[PDB]
């Protein structure tokens, strides 16, 4: 049942996303056209190729980051936690997301606590438990609210250092497999998480930390499927995923979104209805 999904929520790219300062774009210039193509292809893999029912939300120019829907909602089974993003400028994205999730007839829980913040990017759901990164975007209060929302699942926190989100350097690659970056900080984070759990997780170390962020899915007629970064964007990391012969590997470009800190998981919210 882990990795199973029927629907996926995504959101169109606003032009304001490519109209940001160099300091915010890591010094790189965003090719808005290529970014839209990369998103189109990304959605095409999840929709047409994998058969998921796609819910495409309209772009909002006032919300330059509205494309990264993962941050505004954490879904588990039939319950959806509408988060309170660490960045105030993104708090409004919750409106559209909540509306879509309600339309899907899911149990809605909203994070209103003025003292709580949490980005979905800091949430790693293994299928057995939650690991929540304490970062500049997610605080202890936010983690506690998530734990209170999914009471039947263990929830543990991990410090996020030298990275924006917990998943800036990890994500699930299989039923009991955690893709983890090779950096010193990434390996340390995983060690801390593992120490918290009573379950021994397997791990796949990837040379490029951001390449550790991938999307795993269990499709009925295909089996284990994994969307990962391309050999062109991350040569050193692409070959590592090839070690999963039981997985249907799918290279997905994302060079432009990464310029504004968008990784593979950031652009979609998976739902199993
Ligand atoms: Zn993210």
CA distance 244 to 179: 12
Task: Considering the domain delimited by 1-273, tell me its CATH architecture.
Answer: 5-stranded Propeller (3.75)
- For residue 142, the SS3 value is helix
Distance (angstroms) between ligand 1 centre and the Cα of 106 equals 22
What's the gap between Cα 111 and its chain centre? Answer: 19
Consecutive H or E run containing 184: helix 184-196
Q: Which long-range contacts (CB under 8 A, 24 or more apart) does 39-47 make?
A: 39/10, 39/12, 39/13, 39/67, 39/257, 39/267, 41/252, 41/253, 42/10, 42/227, 42/252, 42/254, 42/264, 42/267, 42/268, 43/10, 45/227, 45/250, 45/252, 46/8, 46/10, 46/227, 46/268, 47/8
CA distance 197 to 74: 20
Catalytic residue selected from 165, 224, 228, 247? 165
Distance CA 22, CA 24 (A): 5
266 is catalytic: yes
Q: Residue 260 annotated as binding? A: yes
What secondary structure letter does DSSP report for 46? Answer: I
Handedness of CA 120, 125, 130, 136 (dihedral sign): negative
What's the count of helices (H) and strands (E) in the chain, helices before strands?
Answer: 6, 15
Distance 264 CA to ligand 1 centre (A): 7
137 is in an annotated binding site: yes
- What is the token pair recorded at 141? 């209060």
Method of determination?
A: X-ray
Structure tokens at 165: 């989100």
Asked if 39 is an active-site residue, the reply is no
Sign of CA dihedral 179, 182, 183, 185: positive
**How many whole angstroms from its chain centre is CA 202?**
20
Q: What is the CA radius of gyration of the chain?
A: 17
The token duo for 251 is 């290279």
How far away, in angstroms, is 119 Cα from ligand 1 center?
Answer: 8
Specified resolution (Å): 2.0
């Amino acid at each position: 049942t882990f990795g199973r999904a029927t629907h996926v929520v995504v959101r169109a790219l606003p032009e304001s996303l490519a109209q940001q300062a160099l300091r915010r774009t890591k010094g790189d210039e965003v090719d808005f056209a290529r970014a839209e193509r990369q998103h189109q292809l990304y959605v095409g893999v999840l929709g047409s190729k994998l058969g998921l029912q796609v819910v495409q939300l309209p772009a909002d120019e006032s919300l330059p980051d509205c494309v990264f829907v993962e941050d505004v909602a954490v879904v588990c089974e039939e319950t959806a936690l509408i988060t309170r993003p660490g960045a105030p400028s993104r708090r409004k994205e919750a409106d559209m997301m909540k509306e879509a999730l309600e339309k899907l007839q899911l149990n809605i829980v909203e994070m209103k606590d003025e003292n709580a913040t949490l980005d979905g990017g800091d949430v790693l759901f293994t299928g057995r438990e939650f690991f929540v990164g304490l970062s500049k975007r997610t605080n202890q209060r936010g983690a506690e609210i998530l734990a209170d929302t999914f009471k039947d699942y263990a929830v543990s926190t991990v410090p996020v250092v030298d990275a924006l989100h917990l998943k800036s350097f990890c994500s699930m690659a299989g039923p009991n497999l955690i893709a983890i970056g090779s950096s010193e900080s990434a390996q340390k984070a995983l060690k801390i998480m593992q120490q918290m759990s009573d379950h021994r997780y397997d791990k796949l170390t990837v040379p490029d930390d951001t390449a550790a962020n991938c999307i795993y899915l269990n499709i009925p007629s295909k089996g284990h499927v994994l969307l990962h970064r391309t050999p062109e964007e991350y040569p050193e990391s692409a070959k590592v995923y090839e070690k999963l012969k039981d997985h249907m590997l799918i290279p997905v470009s994302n060079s432009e979104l990464e310029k504004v800190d968008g990784l593979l998981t950031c652009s979609s919210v998976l739902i199993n209805k």
